[PDB]
Structure 1
Amino acid sequence: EETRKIPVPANRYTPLKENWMKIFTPIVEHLGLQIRFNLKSRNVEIRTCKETKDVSALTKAADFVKAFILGFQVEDALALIRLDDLFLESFEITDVKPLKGDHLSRAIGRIAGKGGKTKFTIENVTRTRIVLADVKVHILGSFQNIKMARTAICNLILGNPPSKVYGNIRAVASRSAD
């Protein structure tokens, strides 16, 4: 029996505690994996028991809990539980353009937009989920959808206004046999 341990930061302890039943129930019910949260090591531990139905379910659960810790909602990583062709690609915001200080903050703003609206628009077009950590961007979706979302985000964080980005991603989504 093998196990996987994944860490949790201090800012994700309370979301883990509130959503704990919605996390451990799908892992143990139909995947059949033991789960605990070590408070000393601050780790979510997932284990294979005799009740595990099939191999690689523990990898599925590990991706689910890792996606929840990175900042995604519990149902958007339950999508990683159910679907097979889903991945979790992430990058830093300074990876494409060296931005210092206030400029960097403005880049973060034009991933969000007003009220988060711009971000949601990309999530509507690329069919992905984007999480903005403090200087990090995480995309959950299919491989081509991750490519479209990262193209939109990289276009946003090197200077393009949101309307041009919307038009470009709508043209690409029309061309992508969606």
Structure 2
Amino acid sequence: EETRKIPVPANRYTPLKENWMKIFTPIVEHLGLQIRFNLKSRNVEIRTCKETKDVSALTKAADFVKAFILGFQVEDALALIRLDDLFLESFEITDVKPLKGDHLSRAIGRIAGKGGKTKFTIENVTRTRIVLADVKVHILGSFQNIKMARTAICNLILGNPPSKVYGNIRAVASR
């Protein structure tokens, strides 16, 4: 029997409560694993049973709930379940340029854009998903889509205006 454990932070506990149903129903029904929430250590516990085939889904199942730990929505984690080549790439905003204080918050605002729209646009361009943590940035998609969204984000935090990045990312999407 193979076992997976994934830690949950404190701020991810309440969303884990309100989205638990749509977390275990994709696992036990059409994927067939054993789920529980280890409440003492605050871990997510994955085990095999006698009803397991296609063992790789096991690993996929782990990444499933790991996406929900990182801040992603439930349906995007289902997209990790359904598809076979869908990856996570993560980097800090300061890992590409040293920004301190208000400049770092302004870089966050340039990634997000007013109303979120800029960030929103990049998903409709790149068929990825993006989580903006406190300093971290997480990208969910295929490898070329990850590369394209990562380049768009890095240019957004170089100092390039979000309008220019909007136009050029609409242009580069057509290849």
TM-score w.r.t. length of structure 2: 0.98
CA deviation digits over 1:23-60, x for unaligned, max 9? Answer: 01101111110010111111001111111122111111
CA deviation digits over 1:38-84, x for unaligned, max 9? Answer: 11111001111111122111111101100011001101110000000
Q: 1:166 Cα deviation (Å)?
A: 1.5
CA deviation digits over 1:105-142, x for unaligned, max 9? Answer: 00000111111010001111011100000101000011
Q: 1:171 Cα deviation (Å)?
A: 2.2
5+ unaligned residues in a row in structure 1: which ranges? none
Q: 1:167 Cα deviation (Å)?
A: 2.0
Which consecutive aligned stretches of 4+ in structure 1 deviate over 2 angstroms post-superposition? none
Give the distance between the partners of 1:57 and 1:119, measured in 2 at CA. Answer: 30
Aligned pairs, number = 175
| Alignment correspondent of 1:82 | 82
Provide the aligned C-alpha RMSD in A. 0.8
Q: 1:87 Cα deviation (Å)?
A: 0.3
5+ unaligned residues in a row in structure 2: which ranges? none
TM-score w.r.t. length of structure 1: 0.96
| Alignment correspondent of 2:2 | 2
Q: 1:172 Cα deviation (Å)?
A: 1.7
Give the distance between the partners of 1:94 and 1:84, measured in 2 at CA. Answer: 31
Q: 1:99 Cα deviation (Å)?
A: 0.4
Q: 1:158 Cα deviation (Å)?
A: 1.4
Give the distance between the partners of 2:56 and 2:3, measured in 1 at CA. Answer: 12
Give the distance between the partners of 1:159 and 1:133, measured in 2 at CA. Answer: 20
115-124 or 49-58, which moves further after superposition?
A: 49-58
Give the distance between the partners of 1:135 and 1:40, measured in 2 at CA. Answer: 29
Give the distance between the partners of 2:92 and 2:167, measured in 1 at CA. Answer: 25
CA deviation digits over 1:73-100, x for unaligned, max 9? Answer: 1011100000001001110010111000
